[PDB]
C-alpha cells in the first residue's frame, strides 16, 4: 500500500532528523571526534531497494552515536527492513555522520514526494 509505505517513510525520515538534530543542535563535547568517522554512501538512491545501502551502515552509525541510540537504530532497522522488500553499490567518496544523515533524509523526501 503506497499509503502504509509513506507513513513508514515519514517515520524513517523523522527518526533520521531526530539523530541529525541531536548532534547538530546539541552541546555535544564529542562532536569533533564523532565527525572523524567516515560513512559509506550510495552510488545511487532513488528506489526503495536502495535502502539496502542504509541498512548496512546502521551498525557503524550506532557505534558513532555511542561516543557521545540502540532504540533509535533498532527502530530504524525495522522500518528499513519493511521498506526495502539487492546488491548495494557504494560511491567512492565517504561522508561524515552529518553528510550521511543529510543524504538519507533527502532520499526519504524524494520518495515521500512521489507517492503523495
Amino acid at each position: 500500500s503506497t499509503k502504509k509505505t509513506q507513513l513508514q517513510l515519514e517515520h524513517l525520515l523523522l527518526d533520521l532528523q531526530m539523530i541529525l538534530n541531536g548532534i547538530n543542535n546539541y552541546k555535544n563535547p564529542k562532536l569533533t571526534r564523532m565527525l572523524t568517522f567516515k560513512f559509506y554512501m550510495p552510488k545511487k538512491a532513488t528506489e526503495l531497494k536502495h535502502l539496502q545501502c542504509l541498512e548496512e551502515e546502521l551498525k557503524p552509525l550506532e557505534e558513532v552515536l555511542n561516543l557521545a541510540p540502540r532504540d533509535l537504530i533498532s527502530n530504524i532497522n525495522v522500518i528499513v527492513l519493511e521498506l526495502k522488500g539487492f546488491m548495494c553499490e557504494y560511491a567512492d567518496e565517504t561522508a561524515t555522520i552529518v553528510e550521511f544523515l543529510n543524504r538519507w533524509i533527502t532520499f526519504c523526501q524524494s520518495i515521500i514526494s512521489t507517492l503523495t
Partner: single-chain antibody
Amino acid sequence: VQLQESGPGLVAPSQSLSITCTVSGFSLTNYDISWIRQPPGKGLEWLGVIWTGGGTNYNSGFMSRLSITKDNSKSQVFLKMNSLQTDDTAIYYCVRQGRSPYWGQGTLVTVSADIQVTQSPSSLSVSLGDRVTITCKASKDIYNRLAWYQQKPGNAPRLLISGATSLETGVPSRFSGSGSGKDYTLTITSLQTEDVATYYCQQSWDTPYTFGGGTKLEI
C-alpha cells in the same frame, strides 16, 4: 586520478622534512588525504590524515613533530616533519582515502646519519596451484573498513580488496575477501607466480589507520 609526491631526496637532521603531494583528477574538497611511510626493510605505517573539511589527526607517535596542511585551490597537500632521525628514512606515500583508497607513487626520503591489527601468518612458503588464506584480526569491530594490499619489491602497494569484500577492477578473480566484524580473511586460489609478494591488510575505521604486520608469500 593521480597523486604525486615531491620530496627533498636527502635531508640532514638539522632540517625539516617537507613533502608536497600534488593531486589530479579529483578535488581535495571531496576527500581525506592520509600520509603513509615504509622504512626500507619494513612494513607500512600510517602517519596522519588531513580531513576533507580541514582539521587533522596524527599518529600519537608523531603528533609533536608532524604537520599536515593543504591548499584546496592548488590541489596540494603538504607534510612537514621535524626532529628528524635516521629511522625517518622511508618511502613516503600520500593516499586518497575514499572507499577504495588511491595511492601515490611514493617518494624516498633519506636522512643523513588504538585498534590493533594482527595479521597471520607472517610468512608462507607455498607451491603453484595452492590456495592460501591470510587472516587480519582487529582488536575492535571495524565495520568492514578493511583493505588488502599486494606489494612487490620496488613498487608501491597495489589495492586488491576494499570494504572487506569488494574486488578492485583489474585484480584477478583468484582474490577474494571475507569477514564481518573483527576477523577478516584474504583468500588466493590457484596460486600463480605473479602472486609472489608481501600482503598487508589496513583498517580505516578509526585513527590511527593501522596496518597488519605483513605476510610474505614465496613459492
